[PDB]
Design an enzyme around this catalytic site. Structure first.
Site, PDB file in Angstrom:
ATOM      1  CB  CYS A   1      -0.955   0.036   1.196  1.00  0.00           C
ATOM      2  SG  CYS A   1      -1.963   1.532   1.257  1.00  0.00           S
TER       3      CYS A   1
ATOM      4  NE  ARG B   1       2.486   0.582   3.517  1.00  0.00           N
ATOM      5  CZ  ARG B   1       3.586  -0.127   3.703  1.00  0.00           C
ATOM      6  NH1 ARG B   1       3.774  -0.720   4.871  1.00  0.00           N
ATOM      7  NH2 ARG B   1       4.483  -0.251   2.736  1.00  0.00           N
TER       8      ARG B   1
ATOM      9  CD1 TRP C   1      -7.005   9.477  -1.883  1.00  0.00           C
ATOM     10  CD2 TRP C   1      -7.988   9.690   0.119  1.00  0.00           C
ATOM     11  NE1 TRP C   1      -6.065   9.965  -1.003  1.00  0.00           N
ATOM     12  CE2 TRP C   1      -6.644  10.105   0.230  1.00  0.00           C
ATOM     13  CE3 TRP C   1      -8.804   9.740   1.253  1.00  0.00           C
ATOM     14  CZ2 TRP C   1      -6.099  10.571   1.433  1.00  0.00           C
ATOM     15  CZ3 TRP C   1      -8.256  10.206   2.457  1.00  0.00           C
ATOM     16  CH2 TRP C   1      -6.921  10.614   2.530  1.00  0.00           C
TER      17      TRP C   1
ATOM     18  CD  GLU D   1      -6.093   2.415  -6.798  1.00  0.00           C
ATOM     19  OE1 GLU D   1      -6.625   1.313  -6.512  1.00  0.00           O
ATOM     20  OE2 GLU D   1      -6.110   3.417  -6.030  1.00  0.00           O
TER      21      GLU D   1
HETATM   22  C1  HEM Z   1      -6.215   6.818   1.640  1.00  0.00           C
HETATM   23  C2  HEM Z   1      -5.943   6.611   0.347  1.00  0.00           C
HETATM   24  C3  HEM Z   1      -5.262   5.314  -0.149  1.00  0.00           C
HETATM   25  C4  HEM Z   1      -4.594   5.218  -1.303  1.00  0.00           C
HETATM   26  C5  HEM Z   1      -4.332   6.352  -2.327  1.00  0.00           C
HETATM   27  C6  HEM Z   1      -4.107   3.861  -1.408  1.00  0.00           C
HETATM   28  C7  HEM Z   1      -3.369   3.370  -2.450  1.00  0.00           C
HETATM   29  C8  HEM Z   1      -3.219   2.034  -2.704  1.00  0.00           C
HETATM   30  C9  HEM Z   1      -2.949   1.468  -3.999  1.00  0.00           C
HETATM   31  C10 HEM Z   1      -2.786   2.259  -5.300  1.00  0.00           C
HETATM   32  C11 HEM Z   1      -2.857   0.151  -3.872  1.00  0.00           C
HETATM   33  C12 HEM Z   1      -2.563  -0.834  -5.033  1.00  0.00           C
HETATM   34  C13 HEM Z   1      -3.861  -1.587  -5.311  1.00  0.00           C
HETATM   35  C14 HEM Z   1      -3.874  -2.156  -6.702  1.00  0.00           C
HETATM   36  O1  HEM Z   1      -3.080  -1.677  -7.553  1.00  0.00           O
HETATM   37  O2  HEM Z   1      -4.688  -3.076  -6.955  1.00  0.00           O
HETATM   38  C15 HEM Z   1      -3.080  -0.163  -2.468  1.00  0.00           C
HETATM   39  C16 HEM Z   1      -3.048  -1.418  -1.906  1.00  0.00           C
HETATM   40  C17 HEM Z   1      -3.474  -1.758  -0.645  1.00  0.00           C
HETATM   41  N1  HEM Z   1      -4.020  -0.892   0.283  1.00  0.00           N
HETATM   42 FE1  HEM Z   1      -4.014   1.164   0.186  1.00  0.00          FE
HETATM   43  N2  HEM Z   1      -4.518   3.140  -0.293  1.00  0.00           N
HETATM   44  C18 HEM Z   1      -5.250   4.003   0.503  1.00  0.00           C
HETATM   45  C19 HEM Z   1      -5.867   3.647   1.689  1.00  0.00           C
HETATM   46  C20 HEM Z   1      -5.920   2.383   2.246  1.00  0.00           C
HETATM   47  C21 HEM Z   1      -6.708   1.962   3.393  1.00  0.00           C
HETATM   48  C22 HEM Z   1      -7.708   2.828   4.204  1.00  0.00           C
HETATM   49  C23 HEM Z   1      -6.443   0.668   3.608  1.00  0.00           C
HETATM   50  C24 HEM Z   1      -7.001  -0.252   4.725  1.00  0.00           C
HETATM   51  C25 HEM Z   1      -7.321   0.187   5.954  1.00  0.00           C
HETATM   52  C26 HEM Z   1      -5.477   0.234   2.630  1.00  0.00           C
HETATM   53  C27 HEM Z   1      -4.932  -1.029   2.551  1.00  0.00           C
HETATM   54  C28 HEM Z   1      -4.353  -1.580   1.445  1.00  0.00           C
HETATM   55  C29 HEM Z   1      -4.021  -2.980   1.314  1.00  0.00           C
HETATM   56  C30 HEM Z   1      -4.228  -4.117   2.346  1.00  0.00           C
HETATM   57  C31 HEM Z   1      -3.433  -3.098  -0.077  1.00  0.00           C
HETATM   58  C32 HEM Z   1      -2.918  -4.395  -0.735  1.00  0.00           C
HETATM   59  C33 HEM Z   1      -3.844  -4.592  -1.937  1.00  0.00           C
HETATM   60  C34 HEM Z   1      -4.007  -6.047  -2.217  1.00  0.00           C
HETATM   61  O3  HEM Z   1      -3.131  -6.848  -1.800  1.00  0.00           O
HETATM   62  O4  HEM Z   1      -5.022  -6.392  -2.860  1.00  0.00           O
HETATM   63  N3  HEM Z   1      -5.186   1.295   1.802  1.00  0.00           N
HETATM   64  N4  HEM Z   1      -3.284   1.017  -1.771  1.00  0.00           N
HETATM   65  C1  LIG Z   2      -5.919 -11.604  -6.963  1.00  0.00           C
HETATM   66  C2  LIG Z   2      -6.024 -10.149  -7.342  1.00  0.00           C
HETATM   67  C3  LIG Z   2      -5.694  -9.178  -6.404  1.00  0.00           C
HETATM   68  C4  LIG Z   2      -5.796  -7.839  -6.761  1.00  0.00           C
HETATM   69  C5  LIG Z   2      -5.448  -6.751  -5.780  1.00  0.00           C
HETATM   70  C6  LIG Z   2      -6.414  -5.589  -5.962  1.00  0.00           C
HETATM   71  N1  LIG Z   2      -6.205  -4.615  -4.883  1.00  0.00           N
HETATM   72  C7  LIG Z   2      -7.227  -3.571  -5.014  1.00  0.00           C
HETATM   73  C8  LIG Z   2      -7.104  -2.509  -3.948  1.00  0.00           C
HETATM   74  C9  LIG Z   2      -6.949  -2.813  -2.592  1.00  0.00           C
HETATM   75  C10 LIG Z   2      -6.858  -1.789  -1.644  1.00  0.00           C
HETATM   76  C11 LIG Z   2      -6.901  -0.460  -2.060  1.00  0.00           C
HETATM   77  C12 LIG Z   2      -6.810   0.570  -1.136  1.00  0.00           C
HETATM   78  C13 LIG Z   2      -6.862   1.879  -1.619  1.00  0.00           C
HETATM   79  C14 LIG Z   2      -6.994   2.148  -2.989  1.00  0.00           C
HETATM   80  N2  LIG Z   2      -7.038   3.430  -3.448  1.00  0.00           N
HETATM   81  N3  LIG Z   2      -7.092   1.125  -3.863  1.00  0.00           N
HETATM   82  C15 LIG Z   2      -7.046  -0.155  -3.417  1.00  0.00           C
HETATM   83  C16 LIG Z   2      -7.147  -1.179  -4.352  1.00  0.00           C
HETATM   84  C17 LIG Z   2      -6.212  -7.467  -8.028  1.00  0.00           C
HETATM   85  C18 LIG Z   2      -6.537  -8.429  -8.960  1.00  0.00           C
HETATM   86  C19 LIG Z   2      -6.441  -9.784  -8.605  1.00  0.00           C
HETATM   87  C20 LIG Z   2      -6.751 -10.628  -9.526  1.00  0.00           C
HETATM   88  N4  LIG Z   2      -7.024 -11.412 -10.330  1.00  0.00           N
END
Ligand code: HEM
Ligand SMILES: Cc1cc(CCNCc2ccc3ccc(N)nc3c2)ccc1C#N
Ligand code: HEM
Ligand SMILES: Cc1cc(CCNCc2ccc3ccc(N)nc3c2)ccc1C#N
Ligand SMILES: C[C@H](O)[C@H](O)[C@H]1CNc2nc(N)[nH]c(=O)c2N1
Ligand SMILES: C[C@H](O)[C@H](O)[C@H]1CNc2nc(N)[nH]c(=O)c2N1
Ligand SMILES: [Zn+2]
Lengths: 407, 411
Positions: free
Chosen positions: B108, B111, B280, B285
């Site tokens: 993430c 963070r 947000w 994305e």
């Molecule tokens: C506040 C604005 C936030 C932004 C701009 C942001 C940004 C991102 C982005 C761009 C990703 C990549 C996801 C992808 O490409 O599929 C990500 C992943 C992730 N985010 Fe954040 N995030 C935010 C808030 C949060 C919050 C509130 C949480 C949880 C409390 C969080 C937890 C996670 C987790 C667990 C992942 C791993 C994604 C996965 O493994 O599927 N994020 N974040």
């Molecule tokens: C197995 C798998 C995993 C994923 C991770 C997506 N993660 C989205 C995500 C999670 C957390 C977020 C928090 C904030 C944000 N702006 N975008 C956030 C987007 C995508 C595609 C596949 C497939 N197939």
């Protein structure tokens, strides 16, 4: 223990068995992955020699032949007697081609088999090395129709008589610091550009001066030589749209020729082994031109395009970055110098993975390096799972010679 | 054992000691790196040390380690464990747990915001309708008329694995996908399987290109039920371009609130299989992945034609040139409609600062380079040039199997 890799764009799955051959270590553990880190005797020698000969003879379908056995015997006896051994030309060529094949960071490996190997083990002096290098440069350039090659100088003996090319590439631009704190030329070469001056080079103190060669033979002190200009092919960078682009005064060279790596085959160490292929456009346009700690030209290009550089959200850097990379590809193509774009290059690599998985059972690959530094996810490799592991023969890094050289 | 990471743009070197507290496994060995692989019922036996570890962290953070309050809590939890085979977190502990899970999320980039997080305690929820209500309130709060606030809603923890709460949607808001008999896909291709499930469960599908999916909610191990989020709660943004006036005619829009609803939250050994959270969007994305992935809306062709680019050879970089504009449009559209969004330059810059801060105050920051670096313009963002160490800390957000593969249907 048998591993699957998925392409998430195509759903295609390959099974990897080749990693079970892996010898060397990765720097990762079960506790911590280090995939984003840049740099993570007789009894020693014989198993190494054996592993290599084994794979060589298997590769020619004479595995477990008398030829195999005899050679194993012959090399074994030679290690015992001479504490080292020498590669038959055949093995040297196979070894070099396979080191390339095994380079997990190389997107261009689909070319791996078509490599010209120049045997320079008879070399004894720095002048000799200079001759060999000029011949390599001329062959590989081929009037801009680039051909891949490697030149191999004598193997390490007692480490006190190493052959080393001190330059990082055969062809690279000089970097000078300015009184006003800034840096003229290529910042990545400031230290090396100094050492050249410290040894006698007379620098035109220009922005794009082709650095001289610093060549070290048999452990001796390195000597300076200038690559004949007529052998250094360069490309003026213009844009197929912006007439003002040429006024930026940018050029780059055609031949990417890495000269500071260490080639290892069957336990033997070749510390001077300059090699070359041809550029992928982003290398120059994205990395060389737009990296902050390089030529850093984003601002200027943006200003010339009159973009709103007020906010990051205008994505002006992205806009400019594209144009710059168009110009690079445009120029090389127009002047008929081989170059490949990142879409074409990455697409080929996927094909090559397909082949390698099919005919070899795998292909070590370092996703962090394979994915281009722009437009990542619109290239297929971004969506391609990859397993990184270390196979031998291999290209490895080695310390810069100045930190090591007893003068 | 101390570890050093280097930023090769600034020569700044940091030292990690935090990785020493990592218990979980990465998937890598000294013989293989799996850093680019996408995917890497609990006894009282294995549960107490987990409880204890979590509680020691908690009490250290509030500077009460070793205190009578600390010790009574360990005692309380222990007994409750051996009597009931599980335990309940205090509200204080749940909130700490949630924040830290986010904080430990190595993939993430956002963070820097981790300590600002609205935690909604929904552990008193018993039914799917109860679930729908909680989720509506979450969406309204988090959306906040466009000024987005990070929030998470936490439903009851797993008991015997037969009474799980689950949100079947991968995100609370997302567009349907419909496979046509001609083989082509209408709407978002990533959601075809789920759309089919919803349709199967009685959803009447408008069959358009941007239909907001109904919620499919499972409470207490029971079969899932369908609900429609009130349209007035779903904030969407039509996509236009600041200089290209034909862009609006592309017919694109997107929803404003990214709310991931299919992950699992582990805190002190307890498992929260229903824990939707929201923040947000970072522009890429939507602009890069959602619109331009070949397996998604895949708009590069159409956008390219309308810009009149030389599409005959890839070395014109037409794809790259269209990608950029699409991303300009997404960011422009959101800012014009006053809906919170962050561009990838701003986002990565802040993450570098966050990370530097975490090395100082915490002794590390686990990060996954493969996921942190944005899907466009990689090396002109500072994270590309940053060495990162990737390891697993608890509390954590984990993946879990899609419920339709595991669920035992009642009828
Ligand atoms: C506040 C604005 C936030 C932004 C701009 C942001 C940004 C991102 C982005 C761009 C990703 C990549 C996801 C992808 O490409 O599929 C990500 C992943 C992730 N985010 Fe954040 N995030 C935010 C808030 C949060 C919050 C509130 C949480 C949880 C409390 C969080 C937890 C996670 C987790 C667990 C992942 C791993 C994604 C996965 O493994 O599927 N994020 N974040
Ligand atoms: C197995 C798998 C995993 C994923 C991770 C997506 N993660 C989205 C995500 C999670 C957390 C977020 C928090 C904030 C944000 N702006 N975008 C956030 C987007 C995508 C595609 C596949 C497939 N197939
Ligand atoms: C012929 C066309 C070739 C293309 C398009 C190509 C492309 C590339 C690129 C883009 C990189 C990343 C370099 C960087 O980002 O610094 C790379 C790395 C590498 N290439 Fe290839 N290459 C080619 C030929 C070769 C040849 C002939 C060899 C050796 C015989 C080779 C061996 C390597 C090695 C060892 C690396 C890793 C370099 C490092 O760790 O710094 N490549 N290649
Ligand atoms: C330790 C280190 C390594 C590097 C990778 C350079 N690798 C160049 C290279 C190697 C092989 C190539 C083959 C073909 C090609 N077109 N470019 C190629 C470029 C950069 C900076 C540092 C530092 N400090
Ligand atoms: C920190 C990170 O490991 C480093 O910046 C890497 C990222 N990926 C790279 N990829 C290529 N092809 N070349 C590089 O120099 C780098 N640098
Ligand atoms: C195979 C590869 O690991 C996969 O494409 C990853 C790469 N990096 C990513 N990074 C982000 N932010 N989101 C992703 O889905 C992915 N996909
Ligand atoms: Zn790893």
């Amino acid at each position: 223990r048998f591993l699957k890799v998925k392409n998430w764009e195509t759903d295609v799955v390959l099974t990897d068995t080749l990693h079970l051959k892996s010898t060397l270590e990765t720097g990762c553990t079960e506790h911590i992955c280090m995939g984003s880190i840049m740099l993570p005797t007789k009894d020693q020698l014989f198993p190494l020699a054996k592993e290599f000969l084994d794979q060589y003879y298997s590769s020619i379908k004479r595995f477990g032949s008398k030829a195999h056995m005899d050679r194993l015997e012959e090399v074994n006896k030679e290690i015992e007697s001479t504490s080292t051994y020498q590669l038959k030309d055949t093995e040297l060529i196979y070894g070099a081609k396979h080191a390339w094949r095994n380079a997990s960071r190389c997107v261009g490996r689909i070319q791996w088999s078509k490599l010209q190997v120049f045997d320079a083990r008879d070399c004894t002096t720095a002048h000799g090395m200079f001759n060999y290098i000029c011949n390599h440069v001329k062959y590989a350039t081929n009037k801009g129709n680039l051909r891949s090659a490697i030149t191999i100088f004598p193997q390490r003996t007692d480490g006190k008589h190493d052959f080393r090319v001190w330059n990082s590439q055969l062809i690279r631009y000089a970097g000078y610091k300015q009184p006003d704190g800034s840096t003229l030329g290529d910042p990545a070469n400031v230290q090396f550009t100094e050492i050249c001056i410290q040894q006698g080079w007379k620098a035109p103190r220009g922005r794009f001066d082709v650095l001289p060669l610093l060549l070290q033979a048999n452990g001796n002190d390195p000597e300076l030589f200038q690559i004949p200009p007529e052998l250094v092919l360069e490309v003026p960078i213009r844009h197929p749209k912006f007439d003002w682009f040429k006024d930026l005064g940018l050029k780059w060279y055609g031949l990417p020729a890495v000269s500071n790596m260490l080639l290892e085959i069957g336990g033997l160490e070749f510390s001077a082994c300059p090699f070359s292929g041809w550029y992928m456009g982003t290398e120059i346009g994205v990395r060389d031109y737009c990296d902050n700690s390089r030529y850093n030209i984003l601002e200027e290009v943006a200003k010339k395009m009159d973009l709103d550089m007020r906010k990051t959200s205008s994505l002006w850097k992205d806009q400019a970055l594209v144009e710059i990379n168009i110009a690079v590809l445009y120029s090389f193509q127009s002047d008929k110098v081989t170059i490949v774009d990142h879409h074409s290059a990455t697409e080929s690599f996927i094909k090559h993975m397909e082949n390698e998985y099919r005919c070899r059972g795998g292909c070590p690959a370092d996703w962090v390096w394979i994915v281009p530094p722009m437009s990542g996810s619109i290239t297929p490799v971004f969506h391609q799972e990859m397993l990184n592991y270390r196979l031998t023969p291999s290209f490895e890094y080695q310390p810069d010679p100045w930190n090591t050289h007893v003068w």
